Scaffold this active site. Sequence first.
Site, PDB file in Angstrom:
ATOM      1  N   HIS A 185      28.938  65.607 -18.288  1.00  0.00           N
ATOM      2  CA  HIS A 185      28.242  66.888 -18.385  1.00  0.00           C
ATOM      3  C   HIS A 185      28.779  67.771 -19.510  1.00  0.00           C
ATOM      4  CE1 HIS A 185      25.642  66.471 -14.914  1.00  0.00           C
ATOM      5  NE2 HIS A 185      26.664  66.075 -14.181  1.00  0.00           N
ATOM      6  N   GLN A 207      19.292  69.110 -11.612  1.00  0.00           N
ATOM      7  CA  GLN A 207      19.869  67.872 -11.110  1.00  0.00           C
ATOM      8  C   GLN A 207      20.526  68.051  -9.739  1.00  0.00           C
ATOM      9  OE1 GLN A 207      22.559  65.856 -13.795  1.00  0.00           O
ATOM     10  NE2 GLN A 207      22.376  63.945 -12.634  1.00  0.00           N
ATOM     11  N   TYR A 208      21.222  69.164  -9.543  1.00  0.00           N
ATOM     12  CA  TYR A 208      21.977  69.363  -8.305  1.00  0.00           C
ATOM     13  C   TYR A 208      21.470  70.474  -7.377  1.00  0.00           C
ATOM     14  CZ  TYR A 208      25.189  66.295 -10.867  1.00  0.00           C
ATOM     15  OH  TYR A 208      25.749  65.268 -11.606  1.00  0.00           O
ATOM     16  N   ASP A 233      34.505  72.263  -8.615  1.00  0.00           N
ATOM     17  CA  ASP A 233      33.146  71.902  -8.957  1.00  0.00           C
ATOM     18  C   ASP A 233      32.378  73.161  -9.345  1.00  0.00           C
ATOM     19  OD1 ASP A 233      30.209  71.001  -8.494  1.00  0.00           O
ATOM     20  OD2 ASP A 233      31.410  69.144  -8.312  1.00  0.00           O
ATOM     21  N   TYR A 292      23.271  65.345 -20.908  1.00  0.00           N
ATOM     22  CA  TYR A 292      24.534  64.603 -20.932  1.00  0.00           C
ATOM     23  C   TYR A 292      25.061  64.482 -22.354  1.00  0.00           C
ATOM     24  CZ  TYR A 292      23.388  62.571 -16.281  1.00  0.00           C
ATOM     25  OH  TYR A 292      23.083  62.349 -14.951  1.00  0.00           O
ATOM     26  N   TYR A 340      21.052  61.972  -3.629  1.00  0.00           N
ATOM     27  CA  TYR A 340      22.175  61.204  -4.163  1.00  0.00           C
ATOM     28  C   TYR A 340      23.098  60.710  -3.048  1.00  0.00           C
ATOM     29  CZ  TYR A 340      21.026  62.609  -8.971  1.00  0.00           C
ATOM     30  OH  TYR A 340      20.413  62.819 -10.189  1.00  0.00           O
ATOM     31  N   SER A 387      28.264  59.784  -6.486  1.00  0.00           N
ATOM     32  CA  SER A 387      28.490  58.995  -7.689  1.00  0.00           C
ATOM     33  C   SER A 387      28.700  57.516  -7.382  1.00  0.00           C
ATOM     34  CB  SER A 387      29.689  59.536  -8.478  1.00  0.00           C
ATOM     35  OG  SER A 387      30.911  59.057  -7.937  1.00  0.00           O
TER      36      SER A 387
END
EC number: 2.1.1.103
Length: 258
Positions: free
Chosen positions: A124, A10-11, A77, A173, A19, A29
């Site tokens: 997450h 995803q990242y 993070d 998720y 994103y 977000s």
Amino acid sequence: SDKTFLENNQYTDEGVKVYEFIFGENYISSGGLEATKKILSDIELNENSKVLDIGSGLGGGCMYINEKYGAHTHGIDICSNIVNMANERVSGNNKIIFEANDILTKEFPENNFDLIYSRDAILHLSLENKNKLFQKCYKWLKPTGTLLITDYCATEKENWDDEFKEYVKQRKYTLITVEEYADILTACNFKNVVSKDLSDYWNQLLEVEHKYLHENKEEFLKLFSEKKFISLDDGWSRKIKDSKRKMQRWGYFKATKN
Ligand SMILES: C[S@@+](CC[C@H](N)C(=O)[O-])C[C@H]1O[C@@H](n2cnc3c(N)ncnc32)[C@H](O)[C@@H]1O
């Protein structure tokens, strides 16, 4: 591990840039800067305040908080690559710190923060880990401190359709109901727990982002690819549909230590 799964899927660097394209500069977000202004509109802090941002991403939230209030902000993070990008967005500011770490293993002193803040990151965490995190947040807040969260939530799992189930499964998720989330905070002894189902507003943010995507398709295609465009387009289309019928929900939570 969890770190690796997030950084490699995803990242990835590109995934994060995609994103940022749709959410806005320094944001990955819902609603980017504009939603942030509204979420913080009734929050009071000053230059002496200490703020924790859980899942700080590219750092836009910390940047905004420091700009508006002059507060010390510390962002955590788990994705190292995201933190490296965040650090390139800020310079010469000794009141903004970004740190690569799992929030679940990070240690902070008791009664440390005036505000603990998190935007669309706790989805997450497994349900067991959501509970563990909020116990930690409870300890870490000052007696006068506030907890402020937005997070992805959902209708009861019994109600999910195949596509939604697959969405949640692929991203790994853990999506619970707004009510269950509020109960966790209450169980962790937070006071004045306020929960809002902000799905209608979320739906509004998604529609704006979606229109922006379509209007800027040529630029998107130059930066990325048509394949990435279709994935993102379809993804927002589903969020719009699912938020409209309240299958996928956007939760807001504010609470205090005392
Ligand atoms: C919505 S994205 C970033 C959101 C950021 N708050 C924003 O609004 O732009 C969710 C973030 O949470 C982070 N995250 C997920 N699990 C984490 C964990 N266990 N500890 C710290 N960060 C985590 C991810 O790396 C990701 O950057």
